[PDB]
């Protein structure tokens, strides 16, 4: 039996968010997480998005509408589904003292307007 793989978040400038995870020929990838508040179970949080297909070897959970602002905290788990055999990546979290730039890396060098 295999296991759910690691939801890796990034703050998205001015507004979004993006996820991976390292796919391993699942389904489903459900994700659930809230924003600045702890979870003890399955709360819907906040990000409650179900996906079907990958990206590529990687499943990326994108949401340009997420209105994060630094120094808050992420809350959450994820769920992978391969065929008939799921696996949660719960009790995850994250920050968003830092963004990333489009181009896919972090654009936080200290420099708060």
């Known amino acids: 039996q295999y296991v759910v793989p690691s ?3 990034e703050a998205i400038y001015p507004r979004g968010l993006r996820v991976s995870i390292p796919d391993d020929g699942f389904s489903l990838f459900a994700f659930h997480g809230k924003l600045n508040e702890e979870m003890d ?3 819907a949080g906040h ?3 179900d ?3 990958p ?3 990687r ?3 994108r949401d340009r509408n997420a ?3 630094l120094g808050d905290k992420i809350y959450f788990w994820t769920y992978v589904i391969k065929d008939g055999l799921g696996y949660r990546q719960d009790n995850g979290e994250w920050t968003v003292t830092e963004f990333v730039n489009e ?3 972090p654009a936080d060098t200290s420099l708060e307007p």
């Open 7 to 9: 939801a890796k978040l």
């Open 41 to 43: 179970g399955l709360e």
């Open 47 to 49: 990000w409650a998005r």
């Open 51 to 53: 996906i079907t297909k």
């Open 55 to 57: 990206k590529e070897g």
């Open 59 to 61: 499943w990326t959970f």
């Open 67 to 69: 209105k994060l602002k």
């Open 103 to 105: 181009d896919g890396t």
